[PDB]
Amino acid sequence: ATHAAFEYSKSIGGTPALDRRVQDVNDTISDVKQKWRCVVYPGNGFVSASIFGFQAEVGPNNTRSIRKFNTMQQCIDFTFSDVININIYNPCVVPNINNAECQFLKSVL
Numbered sequence: 001a002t003h004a005a006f007e008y009s010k011s012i013g014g015t016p017a018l019d020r021r022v023q024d025v026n027d028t029i030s031d032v033k034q035k036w037r038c039v040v041y042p043g044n045g046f047v048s049a050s051i052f053g054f055q056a057e058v059g060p061n062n063t064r065s066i067r068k069f070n071t072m073q074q075c076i077d078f079t080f081s082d083v084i085n086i087n088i089y090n091p092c093v094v095p096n097i098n099n100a101e102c103q104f105l106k107s108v109l
Contacts, residue, residue: 038075039108041068046075049108055079056089064089066101 028034033051041047046069048055055067067087069075079086091109092102 036079038069038072038079040072041066041104045069046072048075048079049105050088053088053090054105056087058087 028051030051036048036050038046038048047066048069057065057067059065067078069078078084091105
């Protein structure tokens with residue numbers, strides 16, 4: 001014979017047991033970590049974070065820092081001012097930042 005058609009058949013059957021669809025319940029909602037938060041960096045510069053990382057500022061010599069404020073209230077109000085489209089950076093990632101700034105983040109997250 002010279003027959004090799006199958007229409008749709010390439011793998012075995014089987015069917016869902018009671019419900020064909022699966023539930024959404026949380027996915028990424030850790031409420032305390034999703035509120036946005038500010039904390040006191042040593043030297044009493046205030047800084048902002050979430051579950052996704054820290055607010056970051058590029059300096060004009062093409063340097064980078066954690067975005068810093070003079071009061072907790074400036075930090076909270078800037079974090080609420082999200083219309084700015086605020087830059088965040090990922091905590092302790094492939095480009096190596098100072099270990100003491102990472103150990104502050106491990107002490108806050």
